[PDB]
Design a protein around this ligand. Structure first.
Ligand SMILES: *[C@@H]1O[C@H](CO[C@@H]2O[C@@H](C)[C@@H](O)[C@@H](O)[C@@H]2O)[C@@H](O[C@@H]2O[C@H](CO)[C@@H](O[C@@H]3O[C@H](CO)[C@@H](O)[C@H](O)[C@@H]3O)[C@H](O)[C@H]2NC(C)=O)[C@H](O)[C@H]1NC(C)=O
Ligand SMILES: *[C@@H]1O[C@H](CO)[C@@H](O[C@@H]2O[C@H](CO)[C@@H](O)[C@H](O)[C@H]2NC(C)=O)[C@H](O)[C@H]1NC(C)=O
Ligand SMILES: C[C@H](N[C@@H](CCc1ccccc1)C(=O)O)C(=O)N1[C@H](C(=O)O)C[C@@H]2CCC[C@@H]21
Ligand SMILES: *[C@@H]1O[C@H](CO[C@@H]2O[C@@H](C)[C@@H](O)[C@@H](O)[C@@H]2O)[C@@H](O)[C@H](O)[C@H]1NC(C)=O
Ligand SMILES: [Ca+2]
Ligand SMILES: [Cl-]
Ligand SMILES: [Mg+2]
Ligand SMILES: [Zn+2]
Length: 604
């Protein structure tokens, strides 16, 4: 470690810990920046050499974390929990968690190489027939094609290409990750991830939330299944079975927005998928980012700074060079550089993703002046919710009208059902997926799911919660969890489940602050400077305060609550139930064993 980066001496008292935390702050922004910068150089340009460099930067990060970590223990281990300064307690608490810096050097290098190799496999995997990439090629197929065989070829090709080679590395990664966090006091890595919510009843509270939401999902599923049956017929859709996992618009069946045209209740009303209009009007990536920004400035939140526009990667590079397309928002920890990296496509769902990513940036802009240890969401779910809350307003027919994307205006029960149905495809359909992913990963980290059951347990959960089935036979050579970005990239998932509930709590509160008095699902907070001030208070808090209290100050309650989401969707929840009953649907999938046949001429 460079001499300037090494910790000095501090008295072993709270006065010393404050000086310690200040000295750490100085050196940590330098260390984080080199690490983030090397990650950027790799992710926007995947080469052997960029991986080498990133690995070197990560090693320097661990060295730093180890030295400042061990000094924090040496001086403050028996006393930091009794410090008067709550923010100081949180800073020291972070610094003394070593994670992968607990590993000896050889295992640190193994760990860093595993992350790099798993990232590369995911972001460079192709399906060959001339080879299709995930983004845009396979994404477009899953979203747009209605050919059973084509969908299958993309689904199977991607799962095989990405999943199969990851499996040996994932096993090695799990074991090392566990070894690292065990020396911080956690039974397994999952326990450390869950600790961020600082709630002893976290798993039970999530389970209770899901119990309230499940009927909504069952009704949506049944209704969509029926529409798929009308299209694909009895051979490929079982009206009492799970839906084939490739037919729902998305590689992971996680959001069903893309099959809206097949399920829309009242096709005579305004077309709520404005993708056609965006293309017709010639929208590109930077228009999408600028329109998102202006929503934020309408609230008197910050614009994107010059460094964002100069640094960001907003389209897939046309020089064909390899990049991580999966959209992400970057804090370089120097209070100046902030960037999005997205292979943006001109679609309505991408417009929402742009808002999602810009929500991350806006958090980073608002808390940049906190101590480095506190530059995070009040919990991870908060960071995930910010952009989605604004996108709830943007998606409204009224708002789309204001920005030139929906010329016809209507306010009637049919138009409302269409809107709420479309939103259900994006929000309700995701809930079981958002919930299951980390149930899977928590079982893997705990050892309940050994390598010998990775795919068996994955599909158990996928069927259990989403009521989908794989459209070709799978076995334990397959590693279908690995074909989802967050697994090889070691990004936790439960945050997205929390976010999908929390965003409706946020929406409700911001709408009330805006002075809006209509139905929750027609609220648009655009240009509410009062809504803006209430959201800014959250963003400025970082992780300086318990999330329960930040939530209470914002929405008036100190807990996750499904009631705002239920209220938002209530009209369509009622309508879907009525439709399914009148069609005599079976809710659920009692033929749990059923899988579709292969197409006759597949794949030739
Ligand atoms: C779309 O239309 C709905 C429904 O409008 C209501 O019923 C229709 C059939 C018509 O007869 C309308 O005249 C009637 O308002 C609109 O929702 C309604 O909006 C108003 C707010 O502008 C609500 O009234 C307010 O209620 C609060 C109490 O909560 C009072 O403090 C206010 O004094 C005020 O009267 C009304 O409750 C609300 N009701 C429904 C049916 O949910 C909606 O605003 C409109 N949307 C758009 C985008 O134009
Ligand atoms: C992608 O990363 C590679 C490193 O793997 C970059 O290669 C360097 O490129 C500059 C300019 O072409 C040369 O002067 C260096 O000698 C290269 N290094 C090596 C080791 O080959 C490459 O430039 C990057 N591409 C982009 C557009 O950023
Ligand atoms: C597109 C988005 N990408 C992520 C990347 C997170 C990340 C974290 C660390 C390193 C690299 C990436 C995010 O911005 O949270 C994402 O994966 N998801 C999720 C997903 O697509 O699975 C669902 C969430 C709502 C809309 C977009 C969100
Ligand atoms: C796992 O599956 C591998 C390949 O897929 C198989 O081939 C297709 C045509 C179907 O038969 C499908 O049901 C199969 O999964 C096999 O190569 C492999 O040997 C299978 N078994 C093991 C132990 O890996
Ligand atoms: Ca779409
Ligand atoms: Cl999380
Ligand atoms: Mg989509
Ligand atoms: Zn996010």
């Amino acid at each position: 470690l460079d001499p300037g980066l090494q910790p000095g001496q501090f008295s072993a008292d709270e006065a010393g810990a404050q000086l310690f935390a200040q000295s750490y702050q100085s050196s940590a922004e330098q260390v984080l920046f080199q690490s983030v910068a090397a990650s950027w150089a790799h992710d926007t340009n995947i080469t052997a050499e960029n991986a080498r460099r990133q690995e070197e930067a990560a090693l320097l990060s661990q060295e730093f974390a180890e030295a400042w970590g061990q000094k924090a223990k040496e001086l403050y281990e028996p006393i930091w929990q009794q410090f008067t300064d709550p923010q100081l307690r949180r800073i020291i608490g972070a610094v003394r968690t070593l994670g992968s810096a607990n590993l000896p050097l050889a295992k640190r290098q193994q760990y860093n190489a595993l992350l790099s190799q798993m990232s590369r496999i995911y972001s460079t995997a192709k399906v060959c027939l001339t080879c299709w990439s995930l983004d845009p090629d396979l994404t477009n197929i899953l979203a747009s094609s209605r050919s059973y065989a084509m969908l299958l070829f993309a689904w199977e090709g991607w799962h095989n290409a990405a999943g199969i080679p990851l499996k040996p590395l994932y096993e090695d990664f799990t074991a090392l990750s566990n070894e690292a966090y065990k020396q911080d006091g956690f039974t397994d890595t999952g326990a450390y991830w869950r600790s961020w919510y600082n709630s002893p009843t976290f798993e039970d509270d999530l389970e209770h939330l899901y119990q309230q939401l499940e009927p909504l999902y069952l009704n949506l599923h049944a209704f969509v299944r029926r529409a798929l049956h009308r299209r694909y017929g009895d051979r490929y859709i079982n009206l009492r079975g799970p839906i084939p996992a490739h037919l729902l618009g998305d590689m992971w069946a996680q959001s069903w927005e893309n099959i809206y045209d097949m399920v829309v209740p009242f096709p005579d009303k305004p077309n709520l998928d404005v993708t056609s209009t965006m293309l017709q009007q010639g929208w590109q990536a930077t228009h999408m980012f600028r329109v998102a920004e202006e929503f934020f400035t309408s609230l008197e939140l910050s614009p994107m700074p010059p460094e964002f526009w100069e640094g960001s990667m907003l389209e897939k590079p046309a020089d064909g060079r390899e990049v991580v397309c999966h959209a992400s928002a970057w804090d370089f920890y120097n209070r100046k550089d902030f960037r999005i990296k997205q292979c943006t496509r001109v679609t309505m769902d991408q417009l929402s993703t742009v808002h999602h990513e810009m929500g991350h940036i806006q958090y980073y802009l608002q808390y940049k002046d906190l101590p480095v240890s506190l530059r995070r969401g009040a919990n991870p779910g908060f960071h995930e919710a910010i952009g989605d809350v604004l996108a709830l307003s943007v998606s409204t027919p009224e708002h789309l009208h204001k920005i030139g994307l929906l010329d016809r205006v209507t306010n009637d029960t049919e138009s409302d059902i269409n809107y709420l149905l479309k939103m259900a495809l994006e929000k309700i359909a995701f809930l079981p997926f958002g919930y299951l992913v980390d149930q899977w990963r928590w079982g893997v980290f705990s050892g309940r799911t050994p390598p010998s059951r990775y795919n068996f347990d994955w599909w158990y959960l996928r069927t259990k919660y989403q009521g989908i089935c794989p459209p070709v036979t799978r076995n334990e050579t397959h590693f279908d969890a690995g074909a989802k970005f967050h697994v090889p990239n070691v990004t936790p998932y439960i945050r997205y489940f929390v976010s999908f509930v929390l965003q409706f709590q946020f929406h409700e509160a911001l709408c009330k602050e805006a002075g809006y008095e209509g139905p929750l699902h027609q609220c648009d907070i655009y240009r509410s400077t009062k809504a803006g001030a209430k959201l800014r208070k959250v963003l400025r808090a970082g992780s300086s305060r318990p999330w329960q209290e930040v939530l209470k100050d914002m929405v008036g309650l100190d807990a996750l609550d499904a009631q705002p989401l239920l209220k938002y969707f209530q009209l369509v929840t009622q309508w879907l139930q009525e439709q399914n009953q009148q069609n005599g649907e079976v809710l659920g999938w009692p033929e749990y064993q059923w899988h579709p046949p292969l197409p006759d001429n597949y794949p030739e």
